[PDB]
Write a protein that binds this DNA or RNA. Structure first.
Ligand SMILES: [K+]
Ligand SMILES: [Mg+2]
Ligand SMILES: [Mg+2]
Ligand SMILES: [Mg+2]
Ligand SMILES: [Mg+2]
Ligand SMILES: [Mg+2]
Ligand SMILES: [Mg+2]
Ligand SMILES: [Mg+2]
Ligand SMILES: [Mg+2]
Ligand SMILES: [Mg+2]
Ligand SMILES: [Mg+2]
Ligand SMILES: [Mg+2]
Ligand SMILES: [Mg+2]
Ligand SMILES: [Mg+2]
Ligand SMILES: [Mg+2]
Ligand SMILES: [Mg+2]
Ligand SMILES: [Mg+2]
Ligand SMILES: [Mg+2]
Ligand SMILES: [Mg+2]
Ligand SMILES: [Mg+2]
Ligand SMILES: [Mg+2]
Ligand SMILES: [Mg+2]
Ligand SMILES: [Mg+2]
Ligand SMILES: [Mg+2]
Ligand SMILES: [Mg+2]
Ligand SMILES: [Mg+2]
Ligand SMILES: [Mg+2]
Ligand SMILES: [Mg+2]
Ligand SMILES: [Mg+2]
Ligand SMILES: [Mg+2]
Ligand SMILES: [Mg+2]
Ligand SMILES: [Mg+2]
Ligand SMILES: [Mg+2]
Ligand SMILES: [Mg+2]
Ligand SMILES: [Mg+2]
Ligand SMILES: [Mg+2]
Ligand SMILES: [Mg+2]
Ligand SMILES: [Mg+2]
Ligand SMILES: [Mg+2]
Ligand SMILES: [Mg+2]
Ligand SMILES: [Mg+2]
Ligand SMILES: [Mg+2]
Ligand SMILES: [Mg+2]
Ligand SMILES: [Mg+2]
Ligand SMILES: [Mg+2]
Ligand SMILES: [Mg+2]
Ligand SMILES: [Mg+2]
Ligand SMILES: [Mg+2]
Ligand SMILES: [Mg+2]
Ligand SMILES: [Mg+2]
Ligand SMILES: [Mg+2]
Ligand SMILES: [Mg+2]
Ligand SMILES: [Mg+2]
Ligand SMILES: [Mg+2]
Ligand SMILES: [Mg+2]
Ligand SMILES: [Mg+2]
Ligand SMILES: [Mg+2]
Ligand SMILES: [Mg+2]
Ligand SMILES: [Mg+2]
Ligand SMILES: [Mg+2]
Ligand SMILES: [Mg+2]
Ligand SMILES: [Mg+2]
Ligand SMILES: [Mg+2]
Ligand SMILES: [Mg+2]
Ligand SMILES: [Mg+2]
Ligand SMILES: [Mg+2]
Ligand SMILES: [Mg+2]
Ligand SMILES: [Mg+2]
Ligand SMILES: [Mg+2]
Ligand SMILES: [Mg+2]
Ligand SMILES: [Mg+2]
Ligand SMILES: [Mg+2]
Ligand SMILES: [Mg+2]
Ligand SMILES: [Mg+2]
Ligand SMILES: [Mg+2]
Ligand SMILES: [Mg+2]
Ligand SMILES: [Mg+2]
Ligand SMILES: [Mg+2]
Ligand SMILES: [Mg+2]
Ligand SMILES: [Mg+2]
Ligand SMILES: [Mg+2]
Ligand SMILES: [Mg+2]
Ligand SMILES: [Mg+2]
Ligand SMILES: [Mg+2]
Ligand SMILES: [Mg+2]
Ligand SMILES: [Mg+2]
Ligand SMILES: [Mg+2]
Ligand SMILES: [Mg+2]
Ligand SMILES: [Mg+2]
Ligand SMILES: [Mg+2]
Ligand SMILES: [Mg+2]
Ligand SMILES: [Mg+2]
Ligand SMILES: [Mg+2]
Ligand SMILES: [Mg+2]
Ligand SMILES: [Mg+2]
Ligand SMILES: [Mg+2]
Ligand SMILES: [Mg+2]
Ligand SMILES: [Mg+2]
Ligand SMILES: [Mg+2]
Ligand SMILES: [Mg+2]
Ligand SMILES: [Mg+2]
Ligand SMILES: [Mg+2]
Ligand SMILES: [Mg+2]
Ligand SMILES: [Mg+2]
Ligand SMILES: [Mg+2]
Ligand SMILES: [Mg+2]
Ligand SMILES: [Mg+2]
Ligand SMILES: [Mg+2]
Ligand SMILES: [Mg+2]
Ligand SMILES: [Mg+2]
Ligand SMILES: [Mg+2]
Ligand SMILES: [Mg+2]
Ligand SMILES: [Mg+2]
Ligand SMILES: [Mg+2]
Ligand SMILES: [Mg+2]
Ligand SMILES: [Mg+2]
Ligand SMILES: [Mg+2]
Ligand SMILES: [Mg+2]
Ligand SMILES: [Mg+2]
Ligand SMILES: [Mg+2]
Ligand SMILES: [Mg+2]
Ligand SMILES: [Mg+2]
Ligand SMILES: [Mg+2]
Ligand SMILES: [Mg+2]
Ligand SMILES: [Mg+2]
Ligand SMILES: [Mg+2]
Ligand SMILES: [Mg+2]
Ligand SMILES: [Mg+2]
Ligand SMILES: [Mg+2]
Ligand SMILES: [Mg+2]
Ligand SMILES: [Mg+2]
Ligand SMILES: [Mg+2]
Ligand SMILES: [Mg+2]
Ligand SMILES: [Mg+2]
Ligand SMILES: [Mg+2]
Ligand SMILES: [Mg+2]
Ligand SMILES: [Mg+2]
Ligand SMILES: [Mg+2]
Ligand SMILES: [Mg+2]
Ligand SMILES: [Mg+2]
Ligand SMILES: [Mg+2]
Ligand SMILES: [Mg+2]
Ligand SMILES: [Mg+2]
Ligand SMILES: [Mg+2]
Ligand SMILES: [Mg+2]
Ligand SMILES: [Mg+2]
Ligand SMILES: [Mg+2]
Ligand SMILES: [Mg+2]
Ligand SMILES: [Mg+2]
Ligand SMILES: [Mg+2]
Ligand SMILES: [Mg+2]
Ligand SMILES: [Mg+2]
Ligand SMILES: [Mg+2]
Ligand SMILES: [Mg+2]
Ligand SMILES: [Mg+2]
Ligand SMILES: [Mg+2]
Ligand SMILES: [Mg+2]
Ligand SMILES: [Mg+2]
Ligand SMILES: [Mg+2]
Ligand SMILES: [Mg+2]
Ligand SMILES: [Mg+2]
Ligand SMILES: [Mg+2]
Ligand SMILES: [Mg+2]
Ligand SMILES: [Mg+2]
Ligand SMILES: [Mg+2]
Ligand SMILES: [Mg+2]
Ligand SMILES: [Mg+2]
Ligand SMILES: [Mg+2]
Ligand SMILES: [Mg+2]
Ligand SMILES: [Mg+2]
Ligand SMILES: [Mg+2]
Ligand SMILES: [Mg+2]
Ligand SMILES: [Mg+2]
Ligand SMILES: [Mg+2]
Ligand SMILES: [Mg+2]
Ligand SMILES: [Mg+2]
Ligand SMILES: [Mg+2]
Ligand SMILES: [Mg+2]
Ligand SMILES: [Mg+2]
Ligand SMILES: [Mg+2]
Ligand SMILES: [Mg+2]
Ligand SMILES: [Mg+2]
Ligand SMILES: [Mg+2]
Ligand SMILES: [Mg+2]
Ligand SMILES: [Mg+2]
Ligand SMILES: [Mg+2]
Ligand SMILES: [Mg+2]
Ligand SMILES: [Mg+2]
Ligand SMILES: [Mg+2]
Ligand SMILES: [Mg+2]
Ligand SMILES: [Mg+2]
Ligand SMILES: [Mg+2]
Ligand SMILES: [Mg+2]
Ligand SMILES: [Mg+2]
Ligand SMILES: [Mg+2]
Ligand SMILES: [Mg+2]
Ligand SMILES: [Mg+2]
Ligand SMILES: [Mg+2]
Ligand SMILES: [Mg+2]
Ligand SMILES: [Mg+2]
Ligand SMILES: [Mg+2]
Ligand SMILES: [Mg+2]
Ligand SMILES: [Mg+2]
Ligand SMILES: [Mg+2]
Ligand SMILES: [Mg+2]
Ligand SMILES: [Mg+2]
Ligand SMILES: [Mg+2]
Ligand SMILES: [Mg+2]
Ligand SMILES: [Mg+2]
Ligand SMILES: [Mg+2]
Ligand SMILES: [Mg+2]
Ligand SMILES: [Mg+2]
Ligand SMILES: [Mg+2]
Ligand SMILES: [Mg+2]
Ligand SMILES: [Mg+2]
Ligand SMILES: [Mg+2]
Ligand SMILES: [Mg+2]
Ligand SMILES: [Mg+2]
Ligand SMILES: [Mg+2]
Ligand SMILES: [Mg+2]
Ligand SMILES: [Mg+2]
Ligand SMILES: [Mg+2]
Ligand SMILES: [Mg+2]
Ligand SMILES: [Mg+2]
Ligand SMILES: [Mg+2]
Ligand SMILES: [Mg+2]
Ligand SMILES: [Mg+2]
Ligand SMILES: [Mg+2]
Ligand SMILES: [Mg+2]
Ligand SMILES: [Mg+2]
Ligand SMILES: [Mg+2]
Ligand SMILES: [Mg+2]
Ligand SMILES: [Mg+2]
Ligand SMILES: [Mg+2]
Ligand SMILES: [Mg+2]
Ligand SMILES: [Mg+2]
Ligand SMILES: [Mg+2]
Ligand SMILES: [Mg+2]
Ligand SMILES: [Mg+2]
Ligand SMILES: [Mg+2]
Ligand SMILES: [Mg+2]
Ligand SMILES: [Mg+2]
Ligand SMILES: [Mg+2]
Ligand SMILES: [Mg+2]
Ligand SMILES: [Mg+2]
Ligand SMILES: [Mg+2]
Ligand SMILES: [Mg+2]
Ligand SMILES: [Mg+2]
Ligand SMILES: [Mg+2]
Ligand SMILES: [Mg+2]
Ligand SMILES: [Mg+2]
Ligand SMILES: [Mg+2]
Ligand SMILES: [Mg+2]
Ligand SMILES: [Mg+2]
Ligand SMILES: [Mg+2]
Ligand SMILES: [Mg+2]
Ligand SMILES: [Mg+2]
Ligand SMILES: [Mg+2]
Ligand SMILES: [Mg+2]
Ligand SMILES: [Mg+2]
Ligand SMILES: [Mg+2]
Ligand SMILES: [Mg+2]
Ligand SMILES: [Mg+2]
Ligand SMILES: [Mg+2]
Ligand SMILES: [Mg+2]
Lengths: 48, 275
RNA sequence: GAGCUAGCCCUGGCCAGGGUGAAGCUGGGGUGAGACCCAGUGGAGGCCCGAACCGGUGGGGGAUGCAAACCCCUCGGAUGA
RNA sequence: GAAUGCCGGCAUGAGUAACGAUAAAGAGGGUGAGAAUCCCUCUCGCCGUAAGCCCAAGGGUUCCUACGCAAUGGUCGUCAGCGUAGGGUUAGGCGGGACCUAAGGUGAAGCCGAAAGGCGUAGCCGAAGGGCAGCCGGUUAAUAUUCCGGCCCUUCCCGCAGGUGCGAUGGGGGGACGCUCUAGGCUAGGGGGACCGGAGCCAUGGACGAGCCCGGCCAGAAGCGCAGGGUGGGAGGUAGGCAAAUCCGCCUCCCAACAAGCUCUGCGUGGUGGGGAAGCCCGGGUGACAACCCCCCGAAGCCAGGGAGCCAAGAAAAGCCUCUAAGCACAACCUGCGGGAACCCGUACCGCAAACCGACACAGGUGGGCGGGUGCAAGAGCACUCAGGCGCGCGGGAGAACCCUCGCCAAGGAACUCUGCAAGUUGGCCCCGUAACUUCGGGAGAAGGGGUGCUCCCUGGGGUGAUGAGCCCCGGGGAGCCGCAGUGAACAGGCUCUGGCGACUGUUUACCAAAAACACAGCUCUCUGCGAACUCGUAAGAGGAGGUAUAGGGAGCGACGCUUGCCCGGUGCCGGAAGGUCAAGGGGAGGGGUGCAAGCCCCGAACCGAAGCCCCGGUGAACGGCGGCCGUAACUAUAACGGUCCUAAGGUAGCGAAAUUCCUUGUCGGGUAAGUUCCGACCUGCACGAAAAGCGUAACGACCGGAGCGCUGUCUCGGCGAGGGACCCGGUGAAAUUGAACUGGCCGUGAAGAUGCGGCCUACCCGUGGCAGGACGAAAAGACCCCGUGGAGCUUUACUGCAGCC
RNA sequence: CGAUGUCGGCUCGUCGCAUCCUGGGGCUGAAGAAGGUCCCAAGGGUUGGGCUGUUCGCCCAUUAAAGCGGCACGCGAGCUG
RNA sequence: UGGGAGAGGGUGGUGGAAUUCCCGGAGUAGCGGUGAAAUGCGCAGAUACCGGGAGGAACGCCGAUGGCGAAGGCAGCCACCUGGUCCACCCGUGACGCUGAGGCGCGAAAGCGUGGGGAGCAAACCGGAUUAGAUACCCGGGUAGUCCACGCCCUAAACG
RNA sequence: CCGAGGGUAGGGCCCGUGACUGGGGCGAAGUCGUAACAAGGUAGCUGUACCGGAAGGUGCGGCUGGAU
């Protein structure tokens, strides 16, 4: 049946992308946190 | 004069439709319509703040002229009478001798081809708009401003009418369509006659889907829900109210008055409605 | 976190074919005039049968499955909420 | 050494289950160390509204070629979506951007919030909507509307010519719109040809034929033809379109009007440029100077912004045209022509799937377009087939039980069973015919029946064409022929009678409930006079609603019919300018502390003092509630009648052993041979009863009862047959479980149900197919029950707060 | 209670005997036939249906008879639900 | 052809008296009701009195033993639309008549449906009293209805 | 071919009968009240509506076949 992951590049970039994170205080804390951990990727990769 | 159907479906058995006999023009005046933003009953937060709204027919909003003291003294011709899905009344298209075109709600008895006018000097004729102080006592009027220059507020629904009861100083006593006796200011405008389309009340929607067309989504009885949802929720099997009948939010709903106690307009209500 | 699901908003798209035959209109009759009757025309409907499509009624299978809800038979809706 | 411990390693089950749709395979020839599995050929089978083709999303090199086979591939592998390497994606016109707006988002102004932030007009962003210029063929191993060829077009810059009051983010027009139905004329697409072109064929009894087989086009500028769409001309006045305006709007006059004209599309033709089969021969070559014509069918597509009807009344903005404003009229615009200029991103490949979403090369899920022929009434249904694509990545045997899916069955025919569960029966079309009841629509496909193929003969009407022939489409009548059977295969209702519930079509517990539940039109009550009530928010601000009592909120009831009685003492709500209580505050009789004192400082009575409560009324489609005991009639029995106690008032009409009745399978009646169910009645209603509605009701229901007819493998009662497994052989090879095990029966005993203790009996060692009685078999630290001064949801006249409101 | 699945049916039986039938008896208020009551006896037998979930019971039609009990109210790693 | 009387009908208007309610004023201990009372109402200011407003219904005197209509029935006043009828003149037609099964229409009150309206009255209902009882008569309340529009119902001591 | 009639299916009319149920007629001396005839002690009758153990009451409109 229809499953839960229905990939969509515009949805992905508009929800989790870099600019979405920076627009709000929680998203900037995400980026600060993920930088501090040393994540190679701050944000989901989406081929756009 | 409402129209019936034969019982050739279970719903056609009872469905009644307006006769649309007064309509003379079946498309709106392009320069006078603008897109009506649908809400679904959601507010700027995105929250349902009025339950059970949405999914009705698309409509364009026709700009109605609730002032008319814009154009004091300039007569107009009644060019057409049209359908307006944003209100119960029909609307009337007016070609002014000015050359400007406007919409008013169509009073009962208005005929295409007649001419109307607005101002202190106007004939006491169906369709004319005067400051309330110049209308003789006992005249049936509609589209009444509640305050001067602020716009026609009262008696706009199909078949409604307020009647002038008498004068007191700068103020006139109107009997509103509810039966309240209010003092409206004399400089407030109003239009002679009652609103048209009186048979509007006699329409039988006939079936559920009709209400769906009008944007009315199904309405759930509190008695049908659970305690998390509504004072009347829960109970094993059916259940009486089991407490004073209440809204989803707790307050009582059989008799409890809710007009604000100290409202400054109280100095101007003479008698609350009856019936 | 509403890329699942629930509702609403904007903008598009889809619904083989067949059946029933409302109003109206036309003619005929009727009558003081009417109501009304008859025929034809007409093509209404949360109308009827049935694919697509949306479903999931009963039974059987499946049960370390093909599948963390599937398969077969059968069944509901199918211009409409 | 134990923690259902943690991490790892390795065992057991076991050479066991399985190897993923039952669409299906066989042989020959290649290659190679090695072949059921790769390549080629022939034969066979499967899909064909797809299992074929083209887009979009998502995927991201998977594409093509060479060389490879350790791992991946459920087997094998020489093969591969796998490993290594090289190659491959070409645009002014296709899509998106340098254009426009939609919801929404953002947001100069402005507003609000302890901070973070929340709003917000314009504006800006935002597409699969609007707008905008490319068709056909050829070419590569791999791209092509992109390269090439032919024929077309767009915008920008500049120049020349002609023309004009030129000029905009401003005004206006237009853009610009629904649902159903639908005309005319085309096109796409298709059928036929005794006409045109073609390599060839004559078989096995016949055919050298008006024979068989194949093919008979595509694109195209301007003109022209056909069919459509859009569109009045002129003048005078003008105060409106937030300046102006010759535009638009409004008014008057003249003319024109189903037209025409003008303009814009579609289709046809059109210089021209392409293509071109079967068969044969080795993707090609030949066919071939290929031929390219006639008739019919014909769209849901095109003309298109077409037409009619209906109510639920159907985006915006830019391009574009027009009007003027500053300005400027050496300019500028418009038209024609010429030269020049024309950027960025995508383009491979998969794409109903082995490449996307499902941990898998997973029987699941995934939006758009094309989707051929014949026959069956039609169709995208069904069967078979074209193009095209596949035989589903383990095979070979055997022909037990048993399982699954399927076929048939003597006599009986529901006797099966909780239940006809299941499976039969019926089944399309045409014709005849069709009941109670009814809201007059219906019930209705009621029920029940007859017809159905093929051949000959005669004949009626329609479309095209021409009025005819031909082709096509509906029929009618007569005579015959064959079979068990003519919707001969496939697809395609079993029916009736009678109850309960719900009016109805709808909706629901994604993944155990589809219902009588929810919803529903309709009825009532109540609130709300608009800066409404109500809702969300600290607020600003929103929704309500660009609505205004024929409207909006809340509540219950639930189409429709006939109806909905009595109780206001308690709770709620509504009304009540008296009274009673009533907090802060006012007041200050009178006290107190301290100081020598002026003073400073504390306590404080009467009295005034709101809402709330008390009190007085109203109010039931507000919360709710609607009696007991005793007696009495000329047979008896029973009480119309009476007595008395109590209540705020004592259940009305209509229903009643009921979706309610405990005693109960009540009693009587019906139906059966027999009826705890069913239907109809009676009424001592444990414990109906009137909008938590009462009693009915045509129609409707995958709802739940009862009966009958039909017909059956459900059954008496089983039998045989088919395929896929199970079994055997080659290949690959799991699992939960497991203290160790050298693991028998009885009668006893034992923590009370012993392979393990006692006594006796029985028993050579090890397997394979089977069956499930035991191993208190496995799985899940019982979900029932209790316990914990453990937790959570929910309630209220439990406690105490808070919002909100007064 | 770190689980001993719980009514009834179906299927499959097996045991007890306090015997329903069939075999053998004594007593009889046993004339015969038929029966009553008790003793011995477990070899075999012990039907089909209507009603209800039922066990049980009632009822219809038969019968030699239409027995009563145990086996975790025998039997859900055998089915049903 | 000329005239006449009339609550004949339909539509639209509109006048005053009265009752009730509401507001203001003035005012105080009762009012009301009956056979007698009680319920009820009233110091929370009633009744009685004056001014103001809202609304519905019915039209006093004229009024008659009257008039009109086929019957049911029709009564302030005004206008419009419309039926019948009588008299005069003796002008026109030339028996064109009477009745009338069926048919059709009209048809008081009550009653019914959908809207409205609602002052007074008042089935049902509640209370007070009377009474053996009193589901009545009498009293205080009181919902349909009475009124309007449309559509039904079609009855009668629809009687002379 | 027609055809008595047999069969299957569905209708219409009549007759008999049926748990139970509705009122009706009648029946020497039952129970409850007193509605009508006198102004019958609320004049009566009336069509209709609602109500009540029962006769009846009440409303609305009508008739005198109403007394004084
Ligand atoms: K329990
Ligand atoms: Mg889903
Ligand atoms: Mg999605
Ligand atoms: Mg996307
Ligand atoms: Mg997208
Ligand atoms: Mg998205
Ligand atoms: Mg983003
Ligand atoms: Mg976001
Ligand atoms: Mg921050
Ligand atoms: Mg990582
Ligand atoms: Mg790095
Ligand atoms: Mg992130
Ligand atoms: Mg009808
Ligand atoms: Mg109208
Ligand atoms: Mg506009
Ligand atoms: Mg809005
Ligand atoms: Mg916003
Ligand atoms: Mg937001
Ligand atoms: Mg709401
Ligand atoms: Mg809503
Ligand atoms: Mg409205
Ligand atoms: Mg309207
Ligand atoms: Mg005012
Ligand atoms: Mg209307
Ligand atoms: Mg309404
Ligand atoms: Mg609507
Ligand atoms: Mg609604
Ligand atoms: Mg509801
Ligand atoms: Mg409701
Ligand atoms: Mg509930
Ligand atoms: Mg519930
Ligand atoms: Mg919640
Ligand atoms: Mg609650
Ligand atoms: Mg409750
Ligand atoms: Mg409940
Ligand atoms: Mg209950
Ligand atoms: Mg419930
Ligand atoms: Mg309760
Ligand atoms: Mg409450
Ligand atoms: Mg509130
Ligand atoms: Mg009011
Ligand atoms: Mg979603
Ligand atoms: Mg459809
Ligand atoms: Mg269809
Ligand atoms: Mg027809
Ligand atoms: Mg028509
Ligand atoms: Mg037709
Ligand atoms: Mg139908
Ligand atoms: Mg339908
Ligand atoms: Mg049909
Ligand atoms: Mg589904
Ligand atoms: Mg299923
Ligand atoms: Mg079945
Ligand atoms: Mg499962
Ligand atoms: Mg399936
Ligand atoms: Mg199927
Ligand atoms: Mg259907
Ligand atoms: Mg539609
Ligand atoms: Mg230890
Ligand atoms: Mg361990
Ligand atoms: Mg473990
Ligand atoms: Mg542990
Ligand atoms: Mg571990
Ligand atoms: Mg390990
Ligand atoms: Mg290691
Ligand atoms: Mg290991
Ligand atoms: Mg092993
Ligand atoms: Mg084994
Ligand atoms: Mg396995
Ligand atoms: Mg498997
Ligand atoms: Mg299959
Ligand atoms: Mg197949
Ligand atoms: Mg072979
Ligand atoms: Mg082979
Ligand atoms: Mg090799
Ligand atoms: Mg091989
Ligand atoms: Mg090999
Ligand atoms: Mg193979
Ligand atoms: Mg090959
Ligand atoms: Mg061969
Ligand atoms: Mg096909
Ligand atoms: Mg390998
Ligand atoms: Mg290898
Ligand atoms: Mg290998
Ligand atoms: Mg290697
Ligand atoms: Mg492998
Ligand atoms: Mg695999
Ligand atoms: Mg490539
Ligand atoms: Mg190009
Ligand atoms: Mg540029
Ligand atoms: Mg933009
Ligand atoms: Mg804050
Ligand atoms: Mg954006
Ligand atoms: Mg954009
Ligand atoms: Mg776009
Ligand atoms: Mg383009
Ligand atoms: Mg082109
Ligand atoms: Mg090359
Ligand atoms: Mg438009
Ligand atoms: Mg528009
Ligand atoms: Mg659009
Ligand atoms: Mg519509
Ligand atoms: Mg063409
Ligand atoms: Mg064809
Ligand atoms: Mg003109
Ligand atoms: Mg001007
Ligand atoms: Mg076009
Ligand atoms: Mg050649
Ligand atoms: Mg289409
Ligand atoms: Mg369609
Ligand atoms: Mg079009
Ligand atoms: Mg806009
Ligand atoms: Mg110059
Ligand atoms: Mg020009
Ligand atoms: Mg650029
Ligand atoms: Mg490409
Ligand atoms: Mg592809
Ligand atoms: Mg699929
Ligand atoms: Mg597709
Ligand atoms: Mg693939
Ligand atoms: Mg596979
Ligand atoms: Mg798959
Ligand atoms: Mg097609
Ligand atoms: Mg073909
Ligand atoms: Mg067919
Ligand atoms: Mg296969
Ligand atoms: Mg396979
Ligand atoms: Mg397949
Ligand atoms: Mg074997
Ligand atoms: Mg199969
Ligand atoms: Mg067969
Ligand atoms: Mg045979
Ligand atoms: Mg048989
Ligand atoms: Mg039978
Ligand atoms: Mg039979
Ligand atoms: Mg049976
Ligand atoms: Mg049954
Ligand atoms: Mg069942
Ligand atoms: Mg069958
Ligand atoms: Mg069939
Ligand atoms: Mg019948
Ligand atoms: Mg019938
Ligand atoms: Mg019936
Ligand atoms: Mg009928
Ligand atoms: Mg028929
Ligand atoms: Mg039939
Ligand atoms: Mg025949
Ligand atoms: Mg034949
Ligand atoms: Mg034969
Ligand atoms: Mg069928
Ligand atoms: Mg029937
Ligand atoms: Mg239901
Ligand atoms: Mg239903
Ligand atoms: Mg019901
Ligand atoms: Mg009903
Ligand atoms: Mg319903
Ligand atoms: Mg439906
Ligand atoms: Mg479920
Ligand atoms: Mg569930
Ligand atoms: Mg679940
Ligand atoms: Mg299920
Ligand atoms: Mg259902
Ligand atoms: Mg529900
Ligand atoms: Mg409901
Ligand atoms: Mg109702
Ligand atoms: Mg809130
Ligand atoms: Mg708040
Ligand atoms: Mg708004
Ligand atoms: Mg509401
Ligand atoms: Mg309900
Ligand atoms: Mg009470
Ligand atoms: Mg009270
Ligand atoms: Mg109370
Ligand atoms: Mg209480
Ligand atoms: Mg107070
Ligand atoms: Mg109580
Ligand atoms: Mg009653
Ligand atoms: Mg009973
Ligand atoms: Mg019942
Ligand atoms: Mg029940
Ligand atoms: Mg009960
Ligand atoms: Mg019982
Ligand atoms: Mg019982
Ligand atoms: Mg019984
Ligand atoms: Mg019987
Ligand atoms: Mg019964
Ligand atoms: Mg009894
Ligand atoms: Mg209730
Ligand atoms: Mg209840
Ligand atoms: Mg109730
Ligand atoms: Mg009825
Ligand atoms: Mg019913
Ligand atoms: Mg019914
Ligand atoms: Mg249903
Ligand atoms: Mg159902
Ligand atoms: Mg049956
Ligand atoms: Mg069998
Ligand atoms: Mg076999
Ligand atoms: Mg062997
Ligand atoms: Mg092996
Ligand atoms: Mg392997
Ligand atoms: Mg050991
Ligand atoms: Mg050992
Ligand atoms: Mg052993
Ligand atoms: Mg042993
Ligand atoms: Mg023991
Ligand atoms: Mg033992
Ligand atoms: Mg042993
Ligand atoms: Mg031992
Ligand atoms: Mg020992
Ligand atoms: Mg031993
Ligand atoms: Mg032994
Ligand atoms: Mg073996
Ligand atoms: Mg074995
Ligand atoms: Mg075992
Ligand atoms: Mg077992
Ligand atoms: Mg065991
Ligand atoms: Mg154990
Ligand atoms: Mg065990
Ligand atoms: Mg066991
Ligand atoms: Mg488990
Ligand atoms: Mg634990
Ligand atoms: Mg435990
Ligand atoms: Mg547990
Ligand atoms: Mg316990
Ligand atoms: Mg304890
Ligand atoms: Mg405690
Ligand atoms: Mg404790
Ligand atoms: Mg606790
Ligand atoms: Mg808690
Ligand atoms: Mg707080
Ligand atoms: Mg336990
Ligand atoms: Mg364990
Ligand atoms: Mg366990
Ligand atoms: Mg247990
Ligand atoms: Mg059995
Ligand atoms: Mg004897
Ligand atoms: Mg024996
Ligand atoms: Mg039994
Ligand atoms: Mg038992
Ligand atoms: Mg029993
Ligand atoms: Mg015997
Ligand atoms: Mg036993
Ligand atoms: Mg046990
Ligand atoms: Mg026991
Ligand atoms: Mg027991
Ligand atoms: Mg089981
Ligand atoms: Mg069992
Ligand atoms: Mg077990
Ligand atoms: Mg069950
Ligand atoms: Mg007093
Ligand atoms: Mg005083
Ligand atoms: Mg009033
Ligand atoms: Mg004469
Ligand atoms: Mg009448
Ligand atoms: Mg009394
Ligand atoms: Mg007395
Ligand atoms: Mg008289
Ligand atoms: Mg015979
Ligand atoms: Mg006596
Ligand atoms: Mg007597
Ligand atoms: Mg008397
Ligand atoms: Mg008396
Ligand atoms: Mg009675
Ligand atoms: Mg009375």
């Amino acid at each position: 049946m229809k499953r839960t992951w229905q990939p969509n590049r515009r949805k992905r970039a508009k929800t989790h992308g870099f600019r979405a994170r920076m627009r709000t205080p929680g998203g900037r804390k995400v980026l600060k946190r993920r930088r501090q951990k040393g994540r190679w990727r701050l944000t989901p990769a989406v081929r756009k | 004069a409402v129209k019936k159907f034969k019982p050739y479906t279970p719903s056609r058995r009872f469905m009644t439709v307006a006769d649309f006999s007064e309509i003379t023009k079946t498309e709106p005046e392009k320069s006078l319509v603008k897109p009506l933003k649908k809400t679904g009953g959601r507010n700027n937060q995105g929250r349902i703040t009025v339950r059970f709204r949405g999914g009705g027919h698309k409509r364009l909003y026709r700009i109605i002229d609730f002032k008319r003291w814009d154009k004091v003294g300039i007569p107009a011709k009644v060019a057409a009478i049209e359908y307006d899905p944003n209100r119960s009344a029909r609307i009337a298209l007016l070609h002014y001798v000015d050359g400007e075109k406007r919409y008013i709600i169509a009073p009962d008895g208005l005929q295409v081809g007649q001419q109307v006018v607005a101002g202190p000097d106007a004939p006491i004729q169906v369709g004319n708009a005067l400051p309330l102080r110049f209308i003789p006592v006992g005249t049936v009027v509609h589209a009444v401003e509640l305050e001067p220059k602020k716009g026609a507020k009262l008696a706009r629904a199909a078949g409604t009418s307020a009647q002038i009861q008498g004068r007191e100083g700068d103020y006139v006593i109107l009997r509103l369509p509810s039966g309240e006796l209010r003092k409206v200011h004399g400089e407030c405008y109003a239009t002679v006659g009652a609103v048209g389309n009186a048979d509007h009340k006699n329409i039988v929607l006939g079936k559920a889907g009709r209400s769906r067309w009008l944007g009315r989504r199904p309405h759930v009885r509190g008695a049908a829900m659970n305690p998390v949802d509504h004072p009347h929720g829960g109970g094993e099997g059916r259940a009486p109210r089991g407490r004073p009948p209440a809204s989803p939010w707790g307050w009582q709903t059989k008799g409890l008055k809710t007009r604000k106690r100290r409202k400054p307009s109280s100095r101007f209500i003479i008698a609350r409605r009856k019936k």
